[PDB]
């Protein structure tokens, strides 16, 4: 009773819905912003698009809602729909690639002397620079800048919790990636009067090892038929034609591979590294098989009286066997041996190279997890 109807009344009589919990132009209302992440569902590492979900915990004080006996001293804590406070119509300078879901228009926790607690989980369409640099083992970092899209920091100050909180705090276990750390730094670019956005850093690490495995098999298994086509010559010289069949076959195979590679990066591309040199490794088996094909080509051919008849017989046979013996002199196997071992150098050299680069790529550019 104690002026309850009265209080109750006066409050709703004088209280202003559309007003800011501050008095004039000054230090403003110090709103607390801090989100406990739920998990993340889709990383479009290719366009640098980020759809995650977290809690929008906001909290500041409404010294305009401090109650009295019944709602203050009666029930120190009571729930009341928002819709009555300035809400950070927050957009993300890079990210905020789309609207809020479970972000605004939801109830809030209002304390006795005016404290306000609003904890809503939400899904948000963002876009961070995971750029086409989300695959190097050295990976990269990003700028996630949150802030309102009609307000300018003049009638409120934004403030954070931790900066180490981490993003693996609610990292998706469903992620083909992994994370090292999440930096959180408060910002106010001076290119705009409006103090604004906060930059949040993603020192992301995404190592999904699954198909590069059977990709290796091509390179090496194709090599099987490759070393084979380079081995088949002094193995079965008649490989002559069958050889060409091999490369038709070998080339179509690698071209189909050419088919799956562009359409697969089509959703998760970054530096060429792997492709850069396998591209070379490609060109390598490609041309090596084709010049060996020219190795194959280079051969212009390969690619008394009684006794007289006898004598005429003696000369017939012998005469042309030298001729076909000439073909021997012409297609001997010197080259095959020499370049099948130049094949030895080439393929085992260029092989242990990307082997190496790849080797160097996973270990060397790994520690910049920062």
């Amino acid at each position: 009773s104690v002026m309850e109807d009265t209080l109750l009344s006066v409050l709703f009589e004088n209280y202003n819905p559309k007003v800011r919990p501050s008095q004039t132009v000054g230090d403003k209302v110090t709103v607390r912003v801090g989100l406990t992440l739920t998990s993340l569902l889709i990383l479009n590492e290719k366009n640098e698009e980020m759809t995650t979900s977290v809690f929008l915990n906001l909290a500041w004080t409404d010294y305009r809602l401090q109650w009295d006996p019944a709602a203050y001293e009666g029930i120190k804590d009571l729930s009341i729909p928002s819709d009555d406070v300035w809400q950070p119509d927050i957009v993300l300078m890079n990210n905020n690639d789309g609207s809020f879901e479970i972000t605004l228009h939801v109830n809030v926790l209002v304390q006795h002397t005016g404290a306000v607690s609003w904890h809503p989980s939400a899904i948000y369409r963002s876009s961070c620079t995971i750029k086409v640099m989300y695959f190097p083992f050295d990976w990269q970092n990003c700028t996630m800048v949150f802030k309102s899209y009609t307000y300018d920091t003049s009638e409120v100050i934004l403030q954070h919790a931790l900066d180490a909180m981490i993003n693996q705090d609610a990292f998706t276990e469903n992620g083909q990636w992994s994370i090292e750390h999440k930096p959180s730094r408060k910002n106010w670019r001076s290119d705009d009067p409006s103090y604004e956005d906060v930059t949040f850093y993603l020192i992301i690490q995404r190592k999904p090892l699954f198909y590069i495995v059977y990709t290796i098999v091509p390179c090496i298994l194709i090599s099987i038929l490759a070393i084979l086509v380079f081995y088949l010559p002094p193995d079965a010289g008649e490989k002559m034609s069958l050889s060409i069949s091999a490369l038709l076959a070998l080339t179509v195979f690698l071209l189909l591979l050419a088919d799956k590679v562009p359409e697969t990066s089509l959703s998760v591309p970054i530096i060429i590294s792997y492709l850069m040199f396998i591209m070379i490794l490609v060109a390598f088996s490609v041309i090596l098989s084709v010049v060996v094909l020219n190795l194959h080509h280079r051969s212009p051919n390969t690619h008394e009286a009684v006794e007289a008849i006898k004598y005429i017989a003696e000369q017939l046979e012998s005469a042309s066997e030298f001729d076909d013996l000439k073909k021997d002199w012409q297609y001997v196997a010197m080259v095959a041996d020499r370049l099948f071992l130049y094949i030895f150098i080439t393929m085992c050299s260029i092989g242990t190279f990307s082997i190496f680069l790849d080797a160097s790529h996973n270990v060397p550019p790994d520690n910049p997890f920062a």
């Binding site: 009666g74 084979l228 079965a236 009684v306």
Partner: protein, 369 residues
């Protein structure tokens, strides 16, 4: 007329009743709210990303003490309707599966009992991120966990107490629903200094996998395998089909490669385990290897891959001479090795082929354990 005008003016739902005020008889323990979960349908499953779109009947109950009516409300009709904006409605949040706001399970017509008890239960088209993990593929196919409850209120403003999942499991799913237990609870946490919001915890333990991919996929293996199997039987019946035998490698090779290509395609659409994916590609490689083996083994050998008297002696010379050539080749033929080859092809096919369904079983036995 029995005080009716006056009484609903007494309730005035919106005006007299505090709809922005939840009748929890003021600050105390809580309004006894109860949630009931009944899946009406499961339309889409995504095993790979642990996401599910499913329909639920959001059966809700709580007593609206200001809702109790009198004769011209209560007894006039011991049951009547009143919209959401005129009925307190719990702010049920799909705790770990509402990362996709609820649809038409929102602000819908509710049922008004006579003594305040109210009943609101409409349809929920929802999306969830259930505990798939890369362990929602072994035969147990995990247990999908979900919690439902009134998000906003705590343990002194709300108490929610507690149906099979296959009750409305979708029959067009690529999986199988084995069980679905239901038990409510309430729980505080470390950073919170007080207990609050009670919830409906419903675990769905399921299983899935086709008996169809097995059909057209192993089918080609014993068919293809017989080619590579015959491959070694064929080197005998007629190894002279050198080039043509070579053709078949190109051909059995291109077949092999994109067959594996279709594999990841459906793969990405499905988080496949490492245990199974290897037996597939391991064994096709078994043939791939033996195709390369086919190569060499099929082209592996270095070669198989008195005057009148004077004159004819010349010929008997040329005779014998190239007879040595002729034979230098059968030296290479290597034919008493033939059967052993295809015998030691049989043995291994038996070894590995068995090794697989041997392993098939050694893991087929323990789950059935």
């Amino acid at each position: 007329v029995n005080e009716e005008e006056r009484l609903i003016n007494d309730l005035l739902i919106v005006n007299k009743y505090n709809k922005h005020v939840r009748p929890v008889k003021h600050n105390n323990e809580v309004v006894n709210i109860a949630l009931s979960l009944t899946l009406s349908n499961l339309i889409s499953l995504k095993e790979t990303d642990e996401t599910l779109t499913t329909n639920v009947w959001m059966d809700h109950a709580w007593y609206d003490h200001r809702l109790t009516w009198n004769a011209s409300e209560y007894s006039d009709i011991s049951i009547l309707r009143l919209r959401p904006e005129l009925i307190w409605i719990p702010d049920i949040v799909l705790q770990n599966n509402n990362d996709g706001q609820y649809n038409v399970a929102y602000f819908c017509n509710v049922l008004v009992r006579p003594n305040g008890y109210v009943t609101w239960l409409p349809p929920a088209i929802f999306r969830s991120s259930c505990p798939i993990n890369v362990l929602y593929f072994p035969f147990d196919w995990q247990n999908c966990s979900l919690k439902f409850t009134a998000l906003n209120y705590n343990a002194n403003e709300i108490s929610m107490d507690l149906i099979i999942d296959p009750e409305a499991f979708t029959e067009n799913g690529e999986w199988e629903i084995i069980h679905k237990p239901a038990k409510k609870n309430i729980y505080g946490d470390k950073f919170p200094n007080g207990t609050n919001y009670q919830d409906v915890t419903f675990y769905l333990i399921i299983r899935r996998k086709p008996l169809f991919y097995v059909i057209n996929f192993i089918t080609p293996c014993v068919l293809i395998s017989f080619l590579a199997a015959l491959a070694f039987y064929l080197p005998a019946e007629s190894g002279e089909k050198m080039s043509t035998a070579i053709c078949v490698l190109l051909a059995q090779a291109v077949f092999l490669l994109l067959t594996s290509q279709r594999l990841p395609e459906t793969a990405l659409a499905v988080p496949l385990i490492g245990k199974y994916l290897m037996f597939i590609m391991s064994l096709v490689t078994g043939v791939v290897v033996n195709c390369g083996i086919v190569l060499n083994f099929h082209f592996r050998t270095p070669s198989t891959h008195s005057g009148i008297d004077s004159t004819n002696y010349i010929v008997k010379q040329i005779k014998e001479k190239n007879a040595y050539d002729e034979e230098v080749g059968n030296w290479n033929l290597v034919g008493q090795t033939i059967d052993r080859l295809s015998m030691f092809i049989i043995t291994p096919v038996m070894v590995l082929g068995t090794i697989f369904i041997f392993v098939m079983g050694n893991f087929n036995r323990p789950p059935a354990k």
